[PDB]
């Protein structure tokens, strides 16, 4: 119905706003775009489902997220990919792991403060009837 389409449009507006606020944070610049295969050749072989904030924005616009839970699975993916690909004790690896965890904690914190729980429940109940 039109009311269900209104609900998903509001969701999309909310998710774009959250993603924009992550994307403009200097700490998270490394997660804003896909990894360049020329700079990092083995990334594509090691990381089976790459994810980045530009991809997330594309998925919002393609209507791929019908709940905030689905959205947070891709934010979690951005984080777990970074922890998987950069596991070493070296400062570079430790810096990106720290930023990846900050990205994840920041996304969850914005959602905790600004997502109405009854709005998320509505989205879930529409998706389960789809």
Ligand X SMILES: Cc1cc2ccnc(N[C@@H]3CCNC[C@H]3OCC3CCCCC3)c2[nH]c1=O
As measured in angstroms, the least distance from the Cβ of 87 to ligand X is 9
Residue found under tokens 């900050």? 102
86 lies in the binding site for ligand X (CB under 6 A): yes
Q: Give the residue with the Cβ less far from ligand X, 76 or 93.
A: 93
Number of chain positions touching ligand X (CB under 6 A): 11
| Residues in 24-53 at the binding interface with ligand X, rule: CB under 6 A | 30, 35, 40
DSSP code string of 34-97: PPPTTTSTTHHHH-SS---HHHHHHHHHTT--SSHHHHHHHHHHHHHHHHHH--SSSHHHHHHH
Stretch that binds ligand X, among 1-9, 19-27, 92-100, 104-112 (CB under 6 A): 92-100
């Amino acid at each position: 119905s039109m009311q269900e389409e209104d609900t998903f449009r509001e969701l999309r507006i909310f998710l774009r706003n959250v993603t924009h606020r992550l994307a403009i944070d200097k700490r998270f610049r490394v997660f804003t775009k896909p990894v360049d295969p020329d700079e990092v050749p083995d990334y594509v072989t090691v990381i089976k489902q790459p994810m980045d904030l530009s991809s997330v924005i594309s998925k919002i616009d393609l209507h791929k997220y019908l709940t905030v839970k689905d959205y947070l699975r891709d934010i979690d993916l951005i984080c777990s990919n970074a922890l998987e690909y950069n596991p070493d004790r070296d400062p570079g690896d430790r810096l990106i792991r720290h930023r990846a965890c900050a990205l994840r904690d920041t996304a969850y914190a914005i959602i905790k403060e600004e997502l109405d729980e009854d709005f998320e429940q509505l989205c879930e109940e529409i998706q389960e009837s789809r």
